[PDB]
Design a protein around this ligand. Structure first.
Ligand SMILES: CCCCCCCCCCCCCC(=O)SCCNC(=O)CCNC(=O)[C@H](O)C(C)(C)COP(=O)(O)OP(=O)(O)OC[C@H]1O[C@@H](n2cnc3c(N)ncnc32)[C@H](O)[C@@H]1OP(=O)(O)O
Ligand SMILES: CNCc1cc(-c2ccccc2)nn1C
Length: 411
């Protein structure tokens, strides 16, 4: 009972994905020549729009659609409020393709109704290690290695239909058109994540949260006071004590990342990431873009001892609209980004991320159990959340992998 997804080059059931042995495409080979020159048809009262992401008002129109219409919980307590500066950062990495940003406007008054974005990413997506072992056992080694080389693909994000236009089958149309525009650039795979179950994920991970401002979080009902705190005279005071953090970082020689750090950071990030089955490949220009501090958006610190960069961590800001509470309008969240540690334990490095995030006024720290995120959950007092992030490929058969074999952070 998937009227759109049953027509698409993706695995259809869990049953199917459990059979998948090698990495490779699902669909027949095509060329740009085969792909329609003309945009996908839509009703006369609508039009396709390619927004200019370097133009303030275009960014602003995207910003407003998402502020009022993007991801919210079922209870309508919190909705994502990605800033305009964030969207510019996310949608314009080095060598991005303007045409990959796809919008629907109604022809009359140019009111924004729908959006999807695609950005290029170089991604390793060859057969995972545990299946490459099985391939060596069966003498099927060449088939498994076929697609080992890093692939220049599309990363899809920010799919959004206006609340007044939900359940009108407009989302398939958006995906079709995005797929068209990407295929026209000779790109045949995409990667995307979603908090919902679609057919069919290659990886799934729980969310984890670390309270930095427990009193605000309880007030806005993001989290509750655990039942066991009731056996105390002052439950909230104990909760504040529990999550309290040092005012300053502990690691001597921690500082913000500068441009000269680019090659050192790239090197240690790539060494670390290459040990995961699925993970991005970053050039110098992409390390600069994604990791250099930008106020209100992305925050990156390095550990520098005796003039050498040995560790770094990064995190990014996504605030959420506090829909129901009157005293607060925003939930200020910090999301664990990329990192690498070579001189110290990971929990020691990430502690400073929590320290820094706290001193900057962040209410909470979020992450999915990808990378080695599980290694510091207990000691830094993260708790599992209710959501799961699922990871998906478009037009790529991939075996099931654990979330700790995923090295791609998605914004
Ligand atoms: C080569 C390059 C290829 C590029 C493309 C790669 C594919 C990338 C795919 C996009 C990656 C997105 C990554 C993110 O950004 S994840 C975030 C998605 N956005 C939100 O959750 C924001 C709030 N919601 C909305 O704006 C709408 O409810 C959306 C737009 C989500 C659906 O609109 P609406 O509620 O008006 O429904 P409809 O009648 O138009 O259409 C119903 C069809 O849509 C399927 N549906 C529902 N939710 C999702 C979802 N999150 N991903 C993919 N499909 C989804 C559903 O199964 C059904 O198909 P089928 O079951 O009948 O077959
Ligand atoms: C990776 N991008 C941020 C995000 C997170 C979620 C989400 C939604 C519901 C449950 C868990 C995660 N959706 N989106 C779009």
């Amino acid at each position: 009972a998937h009227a759109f997804w049953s027509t698409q080059p993706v695995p259809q059931t869990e049953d199917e994905t459990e059979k998948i042995v090698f990495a490779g495409p699902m669909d027949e080979p095509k060329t740009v020549a085969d792909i329609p020159e003309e945009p996908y048809p839509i009703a006369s009262t609508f039009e396709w729009w390619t927004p200019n992401m370097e133009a303030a008002d275009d960014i602003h129109a995207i910003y407003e659609l998402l502020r009022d219409n993007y991801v919210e919980d079922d209870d309508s307590m919190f909705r994502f409020n990605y800033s305009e500066e964030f969207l510019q950062w996310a949608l314009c990495p080095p060598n991005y393709i303007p045409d990959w940003h796809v919008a629907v406007r109604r022809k009359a008054d140019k009111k924004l109704l729908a959006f999807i974005a695609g950005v290029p990413v170089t991604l390793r997506m060859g057969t995972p290690k545990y299946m490459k072992v099985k391939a060596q056992e069966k003498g099927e080694g060449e088939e498994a290695a076929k697609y080992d080389e890093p692939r220049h693909i599309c990363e899809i994000n920010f799919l959004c239909v206006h609340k007044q236009l939900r359940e009108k089958r407009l989302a398939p149309i958006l995906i079709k058109e995005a797929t068209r525009r990407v295929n026209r650039t000779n790109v045949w795979q995409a990667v995307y994540t979603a908090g919902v179950l679609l057919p069919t994920p290659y990886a799934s991970g729980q969310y984890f949260h670390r309270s930095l401002n427990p009193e605000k979080l309880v007030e806005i009902r993001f989290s509750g006071i655990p039942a066991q705190y009731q056996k105390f005279q002052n439950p909230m005071a104990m909760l504040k004590r529990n999550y309290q953090l040092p005012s300053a970082p502990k690691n001597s020689g921690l500082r913000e990342m500068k441009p000269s750090d680019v090659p050192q950071v790239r090197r240690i990030l790539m060494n670390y990431l290459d040990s995961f089955d699925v993970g991005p490949v970053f050039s110098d220009a992409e390390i600069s873009h994604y990791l250099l501090p930008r106020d209100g958006v992305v925050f990156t610190y390095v550990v520098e001892n005796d003039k050498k960069v040995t560790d770094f961590f990064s995190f990014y800001r996504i605030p959420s609209t506090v829909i129901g509470n009157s005293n607060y309008n925003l939930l200020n969240a910090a999301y664990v980004h990329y990192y690498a540690a070579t001189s110290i334990p990971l929990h020691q490095l990430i502690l400073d991320l929590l320290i820094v995030a706290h001193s900057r006024g962040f209410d909470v720290c979020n992450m999915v159990e990808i990378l080695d995120n599980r290694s510091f959950v207990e000691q830094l007092k993260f708790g599992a959340g209710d959501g799961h992030l699922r990871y998906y490929f478009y037009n790529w058969a991939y075996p099931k992998i654990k979330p700790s074999q995923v090295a791609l952070v998605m914004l």
